[PDB]
């Protein structure tokens, strides 16, 4: 039950992907919908307006889905590699009240990326069942940048 729910394919449409903020100006736009695994082009990743631990990227499956894992990836920009090392996951079913993802009682800190091109998979165990997924970067190298895929099924 570990299928790509449509970040890369865009079965998860642009408007289902949002965030607390994103980095943009005259030359570049690193919007939430850029957070699609293996995306190419310029500005091929989500980037928050600013770098801190209170930021998040949100996916709205619009349906209830069984999420079994997430895959994350960094990006290289102007010869510099940016990526998220550690992140938290929260979830909701109304998009206002958010449930942290715990494991062994404690709040789960996932180990994400160590470079900018290699994708890294993280299981959700136990399988999370939700409409709204959130990912919260907590540490990172140089800057917060994210391309991702949600793995699951109906």
């Amino acid at each position: 039950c570990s299928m790509p729910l449509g970040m890369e394919s865009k079965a998860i449409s642009d408007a289902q992907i949002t965030a607390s903020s994103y980095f943009t100006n005259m030359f570049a736009t690193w919007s939430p919908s850029k957070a699609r695994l293996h995306l190419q082009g310029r500005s091929n990743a989500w980037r928050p307006q600013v770098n801190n631990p209170k930021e998040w990227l949100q996916v709205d499956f619009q349906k209830t889905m069984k999420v079994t894992g997430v895959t994350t990836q960094g990006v290289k920009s102007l010869l510099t590699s940016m990526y998220v090392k550690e992140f938290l996951i929260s979830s909701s079913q109304d998009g206002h009240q958010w449930t942290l993802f715990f494991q062994n009682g404690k709040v789960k800190v996932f180990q994400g990326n160590q470079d900018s091109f290699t994708p890294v998979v993280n299981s959700l165990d136990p399988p999370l069942l939700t409409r709204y997924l959130r990912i919260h970067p907590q540490s990172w190298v140089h800057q917060i940048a994210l391309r991702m895929e949600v793995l699951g099924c109906e």
Partner: antibody
Amino acid sequence: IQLVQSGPELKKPGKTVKISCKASDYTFTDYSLHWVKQAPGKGLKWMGWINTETGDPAYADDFKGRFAFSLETSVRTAYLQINNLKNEDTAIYFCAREDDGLASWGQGTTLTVSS
Amino acid sequence: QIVLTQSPAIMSASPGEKVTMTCSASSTVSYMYWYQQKPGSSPRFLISDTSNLASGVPVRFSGSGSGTSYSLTISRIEAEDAATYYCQHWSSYPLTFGGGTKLELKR
């Protein structure tokens, strides 16, 4: 920016054709490639795309089956194969470099299926 | 999956006149892209990201809209603007073109 597709093809019903798409510069694994089909009186139909950094192809619903996308990165070329040709494959095939839109297009490749 | 619907199918205008042509999505998209195709030629990139002129494109062209409604305008049409104009979105699977607005010149 230029993309140069190969030339016109006449093929027998049921055979296979392989159409190519060569790129001028080498910013090549930096942008995705798309295939678009145009039938005589129709507009444009998206066939799908291929990731040029990873080689992952993706097909549109109407093109899952007898179509294959592929690459040769050394020579900066994308390919389009069509298996078991039918009359409905008769058309112009474009390739397009995605860059905040389909920003460059090849000149097209006419395919004619006929015995 | 979002469908694009362009009106009018055919439209007609005299050199110097303004033309507006519309493109409605079935559901919100992020941007709308536009293309011009003359017969026997490849399509050509006109408008990137709803309202930005693609490279090499003359300034009598402009696009706008948001949500599900977008439009292309040629402010002062010339003879070489006779063509078919396509809108296109890539906000979800699959990538889609509208069915084209054909601009004929009155003379």
